[PDB]
Scaffold this motif. Structure first.
Motif, PDB file in Angstrom:
ATOM      1  N   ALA A 100       1.015  -1.364  -0.001  1.00  0.00           N
ATOM      2  CA  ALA A 100      -0.013   0.060   0.011  1.00  0.00           C
ATOM      3  C   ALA A 100       0.858   1.323   0.099  1.00  0.00           C
ATOM      4  O   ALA A 100       2.213   1.242   0.576  1.00  0.00           O
ATOM      5  N   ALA A 101       0.570   2.086  -0.637  1.00  0.00           N
ATOM      6  CA  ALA A 101       1.052   3.577  -0.689  1.00  0.00           C
ATOM      7  C   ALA A 101       1.516   3.959   0.707  1.00  0.00           C
ATOM      8  O   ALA A 101       2.484   4.461   1.029  1.00  0.00           O
ATOM      9  N   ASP A 102       0.574   3.787   1.667  1.00  0.00           N
ATOM     10  CA  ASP A 102       0.831   4.338   3.046  1.00  0.00           C
ATOM     11  C   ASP A 102       1.181   5.656   3.114  1.00  0.00           C
ATOM     12  O   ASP A 102       2.100   6.227   3.828  1.00  0.00           O
ATOM     13  N   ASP A 103       0.467   6.556   2.185  1.00  0.00           N
ATOM     14  CA  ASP A 103       0.790   8.022   2.164  1.00  0.00           C
ATOM     15  C   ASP A 103      -0.143   8.837   3.168  1.00  0.00           C
ATOM     16  O   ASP A 103      -0.138   9.860   3.370  1.00  0.00           O
ATOM     17  N   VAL A 104      -0.704   7.789   4.218  1.00  0.00           N
ATOM     18  CA  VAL A 104      -1.804   8.723   5.081  1.00  0.00           C
ATOM     19  C   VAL A 104      -1.154   9.519   5.960  1.00  0.00           C
ATOM     20  O   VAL A 104      -1.374  10.866   6.035  1.00  0.00           O
ATOM     21  N   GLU A 105       0.192   9.343   6.372  1.00  0.00           N
ATOM     22  CA  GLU A 105       0.908  10.384   7.344  1.00  0.00           C
ATOM     23  C   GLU A 105       2.219  10.527   6.582  1.00  0.00           C
ATOM     24  O   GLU A 105       2.790   9.749   5.922  1.00  0.00           O
ATOM     25  N   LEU A 106       2.662  11.911   6.582  1.00  0.00           N
ATOM     26  CA  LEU A 106       3.765  12.168   5.739  1.00  0.00           C
ATOM     27  C   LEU A 106       4.984  12.661   6.676  1.00  0.00           C
ATOM     28  O   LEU A 106       4.656  13.191   7.535  1.00  0.00           O
ATOM     29  N   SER A 107       6.201  12.305   6.376  1.00  0.00           N
ATOM     30  CA  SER A 107       7.516  12.574   7.571  1.00  0.00           C
ATOM     31  C   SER A 107       8.608  13.179   6.656  1.00  0.00           C
ATOM     32  O   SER A 107       9.480  12.473   6.377  1.00  0.00           O
ATOM     33  N   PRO A 108       8.630  14.490   6.311  1.00  0.00           N
ATOM     34  CA  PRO A 108       9.590  15.266   5.635  1.00  0.00           C
ATOM     35  C   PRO A 108      11.147  15.122   6.365  1.00  0.00           C
ATOM     36  O   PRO A 108      11.882  14.917   5.689  1.00  0.00           O
ATOM     37  N   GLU A 109      11.058  14.739   7.606  1.00  0.00           N
ATOM     38  CA  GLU A 109      12.207  14.477   8.328  1.00  0.00           C
ATOM     39  C   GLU A 109      12.767  13.258   7.843  1.00  0.00           C
ATOM     40  O   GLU A 109      14.042  12.852   8.214  1.00  0.00           O
ATOM     41  N   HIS A 110      11.937  12.353   7.255  1.00  0.00           N
ATOM     42  CA  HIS A 110      12.465  11.064   6.824  1.00  0.00           C
ATOM     43  C   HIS A 110      13.632  11.336   5.583  1.00  0.00           C
ATOM     44  O   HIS A 110      14.510  10.390   5.458  1.00  0.00           O
ATOM     45  N   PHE A 111      13.484  12.538   5.071  1.00  0.00           N
ATOM     46  CA  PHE A 111      14.419  12.478   3.833  1.00  0.00           C
ATOM     47  C   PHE A 111      15.960  13.036   4.473  1.00  0.00           C
ATOM     48  O   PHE A 111      16.697  13.403   3.771  1.00  0.00           O
ATOM     49  N   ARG A 112      15.918  13.398   5.821  1.00  0.00           N
ATOM     50  CA  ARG A 112      17.137  14.082   6.192  1.00  0.00           C
ATOM     51  C   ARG A 112      18.288  13.258   6.001  1.00  0.00           C
ATOM     52  O   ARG A 112      19.306  13.911   5.502  1.00  0.00           O
ATOM     53  N   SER A 113      18.282  12.049   5.903  1.00  0.00           N
ATOM     54  CA  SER A 113      19.581  11.056   5.516  1.00  0.00           C
ATOM     55  C   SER A 113      19.053   9.873   5.065  1.00  0.00           C
ATOM     56  O   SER A 113      17.928   9.291   4.913  1.00  0.00           O
ATOM     57  N   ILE A 114      19.980   9.487   4.045  1.00  0.00           N
ATOM     58  CA  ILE A 114      19.722   8.184   3.334  1.00  0.00           C
ATOM     59  C   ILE A 114      19.436   7.087   4.112  1.00  0.00           C
ATOM     60  O   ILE A 114      18.770   6.068   4.096  1.00  0.00           O
ATOM     61  N   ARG A 115      20.474   6.883   5.288  1.00  0.00           N
ATOM     62  CA  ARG A 115      20.199   5.974   6.336  1.00  0.00           C
ATOM     63  C   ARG A 115      19.052   5.864   7.022  1.00  0.00           C
ATOM     64  O   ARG A 115      18.138   4.902   7.290  1.00  0.00           O
ATOM     65  N   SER A 116      18.267   6.919   7.034  1.00  0.00           N
ATOM     66  CA  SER A 116      16.929   6.942   7.578  1.00  0.00           C
ATOM     67  C   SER A 116      15.937   6.354   6.658  1.00  0.00           C
ATOM     68  O   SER A 116      15.085   5.459   7.101  1.00  0.00           O
ATOM     69  N   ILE A 117      15.978   6.687   5.543  1.00  0.00           N
ATOM     70  CA  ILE A 117      15.252   5.863   4.632  1.00  0.00           C
ATOM     71  C   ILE A 117      15.395   4.314   4.584  1.00  0.00           C
ATOM     72  O   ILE A 117      14.663   3.425   4.399  1.00  0.00           O
ATOM     73  N   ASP A 118      16.853   4.000   4.662  1.00  0.00           N
ATOM     74  CA  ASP A 118      17.123   2.467   4.523  1.00  0.00           C
ATOM     75  C   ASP A 118      16.222   1.796   5.608  1.00  0.00           C
ATOM     76  O   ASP A 118      16.002   0.635   5.544  1.00  0.00           O
ATOM     77  N   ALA A 119      16.237   2.266   6.996  1.00  0.00           N
ATOM     78  CA  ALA A 119      15.612   1.653   8.020  1.00  0.00           C
ATOM     79  C   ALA A 119      13.937   1.423   7.492  1.00  0.00           C
ATOM     80  O   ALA A 119      13.567   0.476   7.958  1.00  0.00           O
ATOM     81  N   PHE A 120      13.539   2.402   6.981  1.00  0.00           N
ATOM     82  CA  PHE A 120      11.967   2.407   6.652  1.00  0.00           C
ATOM     83  C   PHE A 120      11.903   0.964   5.587  1.00  0.00           C
ATOM     84  O   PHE A 120      10.728   0.293   6.001  1.00  0.00           O
ATOM     85  N   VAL A 121      12.649   0.976   4.726  1.00  0.00           N
ATOM     86  CA  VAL A 121      12.662  -0.133   3.788  1.00  0.00           C
ATOM     87  C   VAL A 121      12.869  -1.234   4.439  1.00  0.00           C
ATOM     88  O   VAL A 121      12.208  -2.479   4.178  1.00  0.00           O
ATOM     89  N   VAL A 122      14.043  -1.325   5.228  1.00  0.00           N
ATOM     90  CA  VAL A 122      14.282  -2.456   6.027  1.00  0.00           C
ATOM     91  C   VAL A 122      12.871  -3.014   6.756  1.00  0.00           C
ATOM     92  O   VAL A 122      12.799  -4.293   6.903  1.00  0.00           O
ATOM     93  N   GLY A 123      12.382  -2.220   7.632  1.00  0.00           N
ATOM     94  CA  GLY A 123      11.314  -2.685   8.298  1.00  0.00           C
ATOM     95  C   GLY A 123      10.300  -3.253   7.810  1.00  0.00           C
ATOM     96  O   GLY A 123       9.331  -4.233   7.919  1.00  0.00           O
ATOM     97  N   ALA A 124       9.776  -2.536   6.525  1.00  0.00           N
ATOM     98  CA  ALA A 124       8.583  -3.118   5.532  1.00  0.00           C
ATOM     99  C   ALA A 124       9.112  -4.035   4.880  1.00  0.00           C
ATOM    100  O   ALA A 124       8.261  -5.183   4.723  1.00  0.00           O
ATOM    101  N   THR A 125      10.377  -4.291   4.358  1.00  0.00           N
ATOM    102  CA  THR A 125      10.730  -5.202   3.509  1.00  0.00           C
ATOM    103  C   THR A 125      12.253  -5.504   4.014  1.00  0.00           C
ATOM    104  O   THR A 125      12.702  -4.708   4.359  1.00  0.00           O
ATOM    105  N   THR A 126      12.532  -6.804   3.792  1.00  0.00           N
ATOM    106  CA  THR A 126      14.220  -6.859   3.970  1.00  0.00           C
ATOM    107  C   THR A 126      14.713  -8.057   2.892  1.00  0.00           C
ATOM    108  O   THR A 126      14.635  -9.152   3.102  1.00  0.00           O
TER     109      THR A 126
END
Ligand SMILES: *[PH](O)(O)OCC(C)(C)[C@H](O)C(=O)NCCC(=O)NCCSC(=O)c1cccnc1
Length: 89
Positions: free
Chosen positions: A55-81
């Motif tokens: 699912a797009a899961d765009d219900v909540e937006l977190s602009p701070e998530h783009f602060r660093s590439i590592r932050s995004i890596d954790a999001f993908v790891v938690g959702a998919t691995t």
């Protein structure tokens, strides 16, 4: 991380694919590339559901998530691995 290189390579491929993505200082805050936050975010969200079927899961937006590439890596790891590979060859 387990597949962080694919995220940088996958994300960078959309902007500068003619350049080796691993040759880019992935230690730089991609905030400058915030361009993906809106234009790429819409393409990635629709593409993510198109390929992964998530699912797009765009219900909540977190602009701070783009602060660093590592932050995004954790999001993908938690959702998919995906498979684990060495980020450095
Ligand atoms: P625009 O001006 O960039 O819009 C700004 C905001 C911050 C609202 C942006 O559109 C937004 O909604 N971002 C919120 C955080 C966000 O959704 N980021 C997505 C993380 S990447 C994730 O979805 C994903 C998908 C595919 C592969 N890896 C990760």
């Amino acid at each position: 991380m387990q597949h962080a290189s694919v995220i940088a390579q996958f994300v960078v491929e959309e902007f500068l694919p003619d350049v080796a993505p691993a040759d880019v200082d992935v230690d730089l805050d991609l905030v400058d590339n915030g361009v993906i936050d809106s234009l790429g975010l819409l393409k990635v969200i629709a593409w993510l559901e198109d390929r992964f079927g998530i699912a797009a899961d765009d219900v909540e937006l977190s602009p701070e998530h783009f602060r660093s590439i590592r932050s995004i890596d954790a999001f993908v790891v938690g959702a998919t691995t995906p498979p684990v590979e060495a980020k450095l060859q």
